[PDB]
Amino acid sequence: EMEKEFEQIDKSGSWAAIYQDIRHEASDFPCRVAKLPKNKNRNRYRDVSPFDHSRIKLHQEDNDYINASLIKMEEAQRSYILTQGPLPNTCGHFWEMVWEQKSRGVVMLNRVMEKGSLKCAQYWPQKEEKEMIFEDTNLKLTLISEDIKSYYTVRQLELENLTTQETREILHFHYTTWPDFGVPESPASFLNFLFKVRESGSLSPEHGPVVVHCSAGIGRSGTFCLADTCLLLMDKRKDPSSVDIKKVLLEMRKFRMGLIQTADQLRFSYLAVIEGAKFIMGD
Numbered sequence: 376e377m378e379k380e381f382e383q384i385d386k387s388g389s390w391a392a393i394y395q396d397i398r399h400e401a402s403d404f405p406c407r408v409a410k411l412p413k414n415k416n417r418n419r420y421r422d423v424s425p426f427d428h429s430r431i432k433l434h435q436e437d438n439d440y441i442n443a444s445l446i447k448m449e450e451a452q453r454s455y456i457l458t459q460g461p462l463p464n465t466c467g468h469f470w471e472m473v474w475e476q477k478s479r480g481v482v483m484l485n486r487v488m489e490k491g492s493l494k495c496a497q498y499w500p501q502k503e504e505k506e507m508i509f510e511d512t513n514l515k516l517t518l519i520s521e522d523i524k525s526y527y528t529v530r531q532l533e534l535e536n537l538t539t540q541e542t543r544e545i546l547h548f549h550y551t552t553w554p555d556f557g558v559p560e561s562p563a564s565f566l567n568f569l570f571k572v573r574e575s576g577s578l579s580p581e582h583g584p585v586v587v588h589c590s591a592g593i594g595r596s597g598t599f600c601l602a603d604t605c606l607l608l609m610d611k612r613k614d615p616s617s618v619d620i621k622k623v624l625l626e627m628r629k630f631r632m633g634l635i636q637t638a639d640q641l642r643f644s645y646l647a648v649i650e651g652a653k654f655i656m657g658d
């Protein structure tokens with residue numbers, strides 16, 4: 376099993392070597408729209424841009440920009456929208472995308488503040504008595520219920536389109552225990568988190584693409600999607616041992632850059648898949 380390859384690389388400390396080879400092999404496409412002047416204040420980092428060909432477009436005649444990408448995995452029959460953590464003035468855009476893409480869940484893999492810095496705006500209401508209104512995009516957001524477990528929190532939210540007045544239930548899966556530095560020592564919690572997300576139906580076909588984000592929506596985000604797809608693939612392929620992470624990862628990077636930003640992240644990704652493989656597809 377890929378577990379062997381894992382141990383091989385480990386026994387060679389060749390992770391940075393493997394990871395670098397991928398960074399080199401990765402796809403590179405234009406981001407002309409993201410780089411436009413008007414969309415300047417709509418981006419978080421200078422080096423985290425969505426390719427033009429796979430960027431999600433807002434349905435507003437004004438400016439249709441938002442730093443988010445549609446990662447479509449054909450064989451796995453899965454889709455994910457990776458985006459950057461919302462900025463003070465892109466929260467309305469964020470939720471508009473959620474609404475227009477008919478998403479069911481939003482996955483947050485970061486904490487509002489990490490290392491004494493803000494990593495994104497408080498884009499969802501913390502108290503049910505105090506809803507949130509995004510005047511620019513005319514959407515109302517209401518906290519229905521929160522469930523704080525030891526490693527993550529899950530929230531039910533009501534999103535209403537003030538224009539039409541239709542209402543939708545959005546699940547917010549927030550992974551709150553990812554460490555400030557490095558990656559988890561054990562993939563255990565991360566996997567239960569993934570499974571809870573699946574169990575909700577947010578990744579399922581009868582719904583729009585789940586919306587995933589982190590700090591740049593590429594570091595931990597990529598890991599979340601890479602692990603999901605790989606497991607799903609070992610789940611349907613006649614030959615599970617034929618699922619190649621390195622291969623799946625590059626397919627994914629054809630839709631958004633920066634998935635897996637470090638070698639430890641990669642190693643960790645391998646771990647997650649391997650362990651998850653056992654727990655799911657038997658040993």
Ligand SMILES: O=C(O)C(=O)CC(=O)c1cccc(N(Cc2ccccc2)Cc2ccccc2)c1
Pocket residue numbers: 420421422423589590591592593594595635636637
């Ligand atoms: O948790 C994760 O995995 C992340 O994904 C974390 C992250 O939010 C994220 C994203 C983009 C960039 C960065 N910098 C910050 C910087 C950039 C430009 C100028 C000054 C500072 C690091 C850097 C990386 C690669 C090349 C060059 C720099 C962090």
